[PDB]
C-alpha cells in the first residue's frame, strides 16, 4: 500500500508506453537501470524519476495535474525498485 500503490499507478497510467519497463515511443529511453543513468536528468535516483513524471519530457506527458504527489512518489519508488532489482517483466 505504497509500493503496491506505485505498481497500481504504474499499471494504470504508465504501461501504455512502458510495458514491461520498455519504451514504445523512444525505444532507447528504457526503464532499466543502465538506461536511466544514461538518459535521466540527474541520474538514477528516485528524485530524478519523480521530477520527470511531474514535468514530463518530450513525448512523455506531465502527470502533475492528474496524479497526487503521493502517487507520484509511489510510482517513482516502484520504477526505482524494479530497475534496481531488475524485475522488469
Ligand atoms: C507514452 C505516451 C508515455 C506514457 C504513458 C509515459 N511515458 Fe515515460 N516516457 C515516454 C517517453 C517518450 C519518454 C522519453 C522522453 C524523452 O524524450 O526523453 C519517457 C521516459 C521515461 C523515463 C525515463 C527513461 C529513460 O530515460 O531511460 C521515466 C522514468 C519514465 N518515462 C517514467 C514514466 C512513468 C512512471 C509513467 C507513468 C505515470 C510514464 N513514464 C508514462 C513515454 C511515456
From Swiss-Prot:
Subunit structure: Thought to function as a monomer, however 2 crystal forms are observed; a homodimer and homotrimer, suggesting the protein oligomerizes.
Gene name linked to the record: petJ
Entry PTM: Binds 1 heme c group covalently per subunit.
One Gene Ontology biological process: photosynthesis
Free-text function comment from the UniProt entry: Functions as an electron carrier between membrane-bound cytochrome b6-f and photosystem I in oxygenic photosynthesis.
Keyword match Nucleotidyltransferase: no
UniProt KW Transport keyword: yes
Lineage: Eukaryota, Viridiplantae, Chlorophyta, core chlorophytes, Chlorophyceae
Protein known as: Cytochrome c6, chloroplastic
Family indicated by similarity: Belongs to the cytochrome c family. PetJ subfamily.
Amino acid at each position: 500500500a505504497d509500493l503496491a500503490l506505485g505498481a497500481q499507478v504504474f499499471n494504470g497510467n504508465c504501461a501504455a508506453c512502458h510495458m514491461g519497463g520498455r519504451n514504445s515511443v523512444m525505444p532507447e529511453k528504457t526503464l532499466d537501470k543502465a538506461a536511466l543513468e544514461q538518459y535521466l536528468d540527474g541520474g538514477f535516483k528516485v528524485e530524478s524519476i519523480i521530477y520527470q513524471v511531474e514535468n514530463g519530457k518530450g513525448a512523455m506527458p506531465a502527470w502533475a495535474d492528474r496524479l497526487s504527489e503521493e502517487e507520484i512518489q509511489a510510482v517513482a519508488e516502484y520504477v526505482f525498485k524494479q530497475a534496481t532489482d531488475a524485475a522488469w517483466k
